[PDB]
Amino acid sequence: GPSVFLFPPKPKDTLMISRTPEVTCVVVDVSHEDPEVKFNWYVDGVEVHNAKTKPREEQYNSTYRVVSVLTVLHQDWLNGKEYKCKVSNKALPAPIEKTISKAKGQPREPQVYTLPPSREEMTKNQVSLTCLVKGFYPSDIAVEWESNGQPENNYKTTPPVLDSDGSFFLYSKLTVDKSRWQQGNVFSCSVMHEALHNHYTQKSLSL
Amino acid sequence: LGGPSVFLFPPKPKDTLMISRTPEVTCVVVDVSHEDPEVKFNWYVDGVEVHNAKTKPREEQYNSTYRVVSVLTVLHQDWLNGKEYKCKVSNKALPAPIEKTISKAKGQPREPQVYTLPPSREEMTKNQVSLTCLVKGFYPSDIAVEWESNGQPENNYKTTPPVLDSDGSFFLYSKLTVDKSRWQQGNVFSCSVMHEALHNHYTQKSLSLSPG
Amino acid sequence: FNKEQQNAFYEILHLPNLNEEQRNAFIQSLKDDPSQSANLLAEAKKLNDAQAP
Amino acid sequence: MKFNKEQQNAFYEILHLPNLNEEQRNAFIQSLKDDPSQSANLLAEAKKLNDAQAP
Ligand SMILES: *[C@@H]1O[C@H](CO[C@@H]2O[C@@H](C)[C@@H](O)[C@@H](O)[C@@H]2O)[C@@H](O[C@@H]2O[C@H](CO)[C@@H](O[C@H]3O[C@H](CO[C@H]4O[C@H](CO)[C@@H](O)[C@H](O)[C@@H]4O[C@@H]4O[C@H](CO)[C@@H](O[C@@H]5O[C@H](CO)[C@H](O)[C@H](O)[C@H]5O)[C@H](O)[C@H]4NC(C)=O)[C@@H](O)[C@H](O[C@H]4O[C@H](CO)[C@@H](O)[C@H](O)[C@@H]4O)[C@@H]3O)[C@H](O)[C@H]2NC(C)=O)[C@H](O)[C@H]1NC(C)=O
Ligand SMILES: *[C@@H]1O[C@H](CO[C@@H]2O[C@@H](C)[C@@H](O)[C@@H](O)[C@@H]2O)[C@@H](O[C@@H]2O[C@H](CO)[C@@H](O[C@H]3O[C@H](CO[C@H]4O[C@H](CO)[C@@H](O)[C@H](O)[C@@H]4O[C@@H]4O[C@H](CO)[C@@H](O)[C@H](O)[C@H]4NC(C)=O)[C@@H](O)[C@H](O[C@H]4O[C@H](CO)[C@@H](O)[C@H](O)[C@@H]4O)[C@@H]3O)[C@H](O)[C@H]2NC(C)=O)[C@H](O)[C@H]1NC(C)=O
C-alpha cells in the first residue's frame, strides 16, 4: 500500500534563531478508496499535538499525497531529541513508524578557507572563487556567498564528503565575471554550523 | 517474498578510458532466498547475446539472504560508442525473468578545464595542508581524478562527486592532504584527470610552492 | 538576520547550569521579542552563575 | 599510473579515426592490447587505411 518518508529540517533553520525549523512527514501511495490519513507525532517517546496537516493533494497518479509538518525547537533538534511520525490508515496492516534525529558523535568545528582563482583561469571571461570548508561534524551545514552586504547567488556547493578522519568537507564555487574580480571587489563565504561560535562564521576573499 | 532484486552497474570511468585497464559491467542480484538459490544470467550487447560473462560464487548476507554477482568484460570502444548492455536474471521460480539495461550518458561531450590551487595562507598554520584540484566544464559526469608526486601515487586524497553547474556541464573538486613540511620543501604534486573529451583521455596539472 | 539575537540564542543554548525549562523560556522570549536579547542574555548569565556549585 | 603513453595515444586516435569501420577499428585496438610494443606501427597502419578510405 502506502509509504511514509520522514525529512529533517534544513540545517540553516535549526541553527538560525530567526528561522523556524520543521520536521516533515510525507505519506505517498495513498488510496482513493480509503484516503483518510491519521498522524501521531512523538518527541523522545512523548506525544505532541502541535503538528499541522496539509489538506491532501491530488497526484500524478490517480493518487493523493498528504503531508504533516511538526514545528520543532532549535535546541531540541540540536540536543539530539528523537522525532517520530506514526501514520495510520486502513490500507496498512499495522501503522507505520519513522524516527529521525541529528547524527550522533562529537561535533567538530569547520575550518573555512577561501581560495582565489587559479592563475591559469584568468584567461577566461568568468573565474571561480573557491570556499573550502573542512573538518566539520556532523555533515549538516549551510554555505552562502555575498558581496558588499548583498547576496551573490551564482554559486554551487558540493555535497558533504566523508574525509579520512571521519570528519566531513566540501567546496563551494562562486562564479563571477573576471572584470569584477580584477577590480578588487571583496567577496565573502558564509558558513553556518553548530560547532561554530554563534553557529556562524564568514571568510573574505579579494585580489 | 517479493522476488529478488537486480541492480546493474556501469564500469569505472577510468577503466573505459585507459586501454591498459579492463572495464566491467556488473550485474548484482539481491534478496535471493536460501530456498531458490540457483541464479542464471543472460547478457546482451545491443540485443545480441554474448557468452563471456563470469559468475561469482553465491555469498551469504547479513539478513540471512544470499547475494550473487555476474561480471561482463566489455570493450572500451563499445561503452564509449553508446552500446546497450543488458543483464537478464532467471530462476525456475521467478514468475518472469528480470531485465536491466544500461549505457553511457547521451549528450555532446565537453572538455574539462583543470586548475590546481595551493593552500590558503590561513591553513599554513596547520601541520597538514590541502592541495586543491578544480575540474570544471566537463560532460558527461563520468570522470576519474588521481594525485601523484615524483612519479608515485599519493593516496591521502578525497574527491567530491560531480556537481551539475549552471550551464549543464559538471564540475568537481579533489582535495589532497599533505604534511606542510613536504609542501615547504618544494615537492611537486600532480592532479591527473581522465575524461573522454580530453586528448588521450588524459591531462595533468602540477602544483608546488612557487612565486606568486 | 539580527546579530545580537543570534548571539544571545547561541550562548543561552550552551549555558551549562540552566535546566531545560529555564533555557527554553529564555529562548522563547528571544523568539517573541528580538529587541530583548541583551537583557535576556544578561539575565540568563546571572541565573547560570547563581546555579553554579 | 605507470601507463604506456604511446599505447594510450594510439588507442585514442584510432578510436577517433572517422573512416574506419567497426571491425577494422576493433582489430587494431585488439592488436594494441595484445602487443603494446606495436603501437607506433599500428597507429601508422590505421592512419593510412583511414586516409585510403576517405571520401
Ligand atoms: C504515484 O506518483 C507519486 C508522485 O511522485 C512522482 O513519482 C515519480 C515516479 C515521478 O513521477 C515524479 O514526477 C513524482 O515525484 C509517487 O510518489 C513517489 O514515491 C516514491 C516512493 O516509491 C518516493 O521516492 C523517494 O522519496 C524520497 C525522495 O523524495 C524527496 O526528494 C525528491 C527529489 O529529491 C522530491 O521530489 C521529494 O518531494 C522529496 O523532497 C524532500 O521533500 C521534503 C519534504 O517536504 C523536504 O523537506 C522539507 O522541505 C521544506 C521546504 O519545502 C522545509 O525545508 C522543511 O523544513 C523540510 O523538512 C526536502 O527539502 C526534500 N528533500 C530532497 C532530498 O529532495 C527518498 O528519500 C526515498 O528514498 C529513501 O528511502 C528509501 C527507503 O524507502 C531508501 O532506499 C533510499 O536510499 C533513501 O534513503 C524514496 O526513494 C517519491 O519521493 C514520491 N514522490 C514524492 C513527491 O514524495 C508514487 O510512488 C506513485 N505511486 C506508485 C504506486 O508508485
Ligand atoms: C539484506 O541485506 C542486503 C545486504 O546488503 C547490504 O549492504 C549494505 C548496503 C548495508 O545496507 C548492509 O547492512 C547490508 O548487508 C541488502 O542488499 C542491498 O539491497 C539494496 C536494495 O534493497 C540495494 O540498494 C541500492 O543499491 C545501489 C548501490 O549499490 C552500490 O552501492 C552501495 C553503497 O552505495 C554498495 O553497498 C553496493 O555494494 C553497490 O556498490 C557498487 O558495487 C558495484 C558492483 O560490485 C561496483 O561496480 C560499484 O563501484 C559499487 N558502487 C559503490 C558506490 O560502492 C543503488 O544505486 C540503488 O539505488 C536505486 O535507488 C532506487 C530504489 O532502489 C531506484 O529507483 C534507483 O533507480 C536506483 O537504482 C539501490 O537503492 C543495495 O545495493 C544492496 N546491497 C548490496 C551490497 O548489494 C538487502 O537490501 C537486504 N534485504 C532486506 C529485505 O533487508
Please tell me the number of the ligand nearest to residue B14's CA.
Answer: 2
**B37 preceded by a cis bond (ω within 30 of 0):** no
**C-alpha distances out from residue A206 to A56, A97, A187, A203, B118, Å:** 50, 51, 6, 10, 16
Asked whether residue B81 falls in the same domain as residue B111, the answer is no
**C-alpha distances out from residue A178 to A150, B137, D19, Å:** 19, 17, 42
Here the cell at position A65 is: 499525497
The DSSP letter of residue A194 is: T
CA angle A124–A128–A129, rounded 5-degree value: 145
One-letter amino acid at A179 equals S
Q: Which positions of A make up the binding site for Zn(2+)?
A: 32, 74, 82, 199
Alpha carbon of C29 to ligand 2 centroid (Å): 47
Asked whether residue A73 falls in the same domain as residue A170, the answer is no
Q: Looking at the CA of residue B10, tell me the nearest atom of ligand 2.
A: 47
Q: Out of B103, B127, B152, pick the residue that ends a domain.
A: B103
Question: Is A39 in contact with A25 (CB distance < 8 Å)?
Answer: yes
**Range(s) of the domain holding residue B120:** 104-212
Here the cell at position D30 is: 585488439
Chain D residues with CB inside 8 Å of B76's CB? 11, 15, 29
Question: Residue D45: helix, strand or coil by DSSP?
Answer: helix
Give chain B's largest Cα–Cα span. 70
Return the residue of D nearest to B149 by Cα.
D1
Chain D residues with CB inside 8 Å of B20's CB? 1, 3-4, 7-8
Cβ distance of D26 and B75 shorter than 8 Å: yes
B12 burial level (CB within 10 Å; 0-12, 13-18, 19+): middle
Tell me how many domains chain A contains: 2
Return the residue of A nearest to C8 by Cα.
A198
Residue of the nearest CA to atom 1 in ligand 1? A61
Residue found by looking up cell 584527470 in the block: B193
The DSSP letter of residue B124 is: G
Asked whether residue A72 falls in the same domain as residue A122, the answer is no
Residue of the nearest CA to atom 46 in ligand 2? B9
Radius of gyration of chain C (CA): 10
Establish whether B51 is an annotated binding residue: no
C12 burial level (CB within 10 Å; 0-12, 13-18, 19+): buried
**C-alpha distances out from residue D13 to B106, B130, D20, D44, Å:** 21, 36, 11, 11
Domains, chain C, in order of start with CATH, read 1-53 (1.20.5.420)
Asked whether residue A206 falls in the same domain as residue A106, the answer is yes
Q: Out of A47, A71, A101, pick the residue that ends a domain.
A: A101
Closest to A145 in 3D by CA, of A110, A184, A198, A185: A185
Question: Is A184 in contact with A198 (CB distance < 8 Å)?
Answer: no
Residue of the nearest CA to atom 46 in ligand 1? A7
Q: Out of B103, B137, B160, pick the residue that ends a domain.
A: B103
Q: Residue count of chain C, please give it.
A: 53
Domain containing A66 — which CATH number? 2.60.40.10
Asked whether residue B117 falls in the same domain as residue B88, the answer is no
CA angle B105–B107–B112, rounded 5-degree value: 90
How was this structure determined? It was done by X-ray
Closest to C29 in 3D by CA, of A17, B68, B146: A17
Cβ distance of A128 and B116 shorter than 8 Å: no
Here the cell at position B161 is: 562527486
Resolution to 1 decimal place, in Å: 2.5
Segments in A2-44 forming alpha helices (H):
11-15
Cβ distance of C10 and A74 shorter than 8 Å: no
Chain A residues with CB inside 8 Å of B123's CB? 111, 113
Cβ distance of A121 and B130 shorter than 8 Å: no
Asked whether residue A118 falls in the same domain as residue A206, the answer is yes
- CA–CA separation, B182 and D22 (whole Å): 49
Here the cell at position C15 is: 549555558
Residue of the nearest CA to atom 84 in ligand 2? B31
In this complex, how many residue pairs, one in chain A and one in chain B, have their CB atoms less than 8 Å apart? 71
> Given ligand 2 and candidates B1, B8, B9, which is best to mutate, with the most ligand atoms within 8 Å of its CB?
B9
Nearest to B200 among D12, D32, D33 (CB): D12
Asked whether residue A97 falls in the same domain as residue A146, the answer is no
Nearest to B77 among D7, D9, D25 (CB): D25
Residue of the nearest CA to atom 43 in ligand 1? A7
Asked whether residue B74 falls in the same domain as residue B96, the answer is yes
With an 8 Å CB cutoff and a minimum of 3 pairs, decide whether chains A and B touch. yes
Return the residue of A nearest to C10 by Cα.
A198
Residues framing ligand 2 (Cβ under 6 A): B 5, 7, 9, 26, 28, 30-31, 61-63, 65
B18 burial level (CB within 10 Å; 0-12, 13-18, 19+): buried
Asked whether residue A136 falls in the same domain as residue A83, the answer is no
Asked whether residue B147 falls in the same domain as residue B83, the answer is no
Question: Is A61 in contact with A11 (CB distance < 8 Å)?
Answer: no
Nearest to D8 among B19, B77, B80 (CB): B19
Asked whether residue B18 falls in the same domain as residue B29, the answer is yes
Q: Chain D neighbours among B 36-65 (CB < 8 Å)?
A: none
Return the residue of D nearest to B14 by Cα.
D1
**Is A9's C-beta closer than 6 angstroms to any atom of ligand 1?**
yes
C31 contact partners, CB below 8 Å, separation of at least 6: A17
The DSSP letter of residue B40 is: E
What phi and psi, each to the nearest 5 degrees, are found at residue B76? -45, -50
Asked whether residue B43 falls in the same domain as residue B56, the answer is yes
Question: Residue D25: helix, strand or coil by DSSP?
Answer: helix
Nearest to D11 among B19, B192, B199 (CB): B19
- CA–CA separation, B45 and B83 (whole Å): 7
Handedness of CA B154, B185, B175, A8 (dihedral sign): positive
Cβ distance of B75 and D9 shorter than 8 Å: no
- CA–CA separation, A163 and A173 (whole Å): 19
**A neighbours by CB contacts (3+ pairs under 8 Å):** B, C
Alpha carbon of C16 to ligand 1 centroid (Å): 39
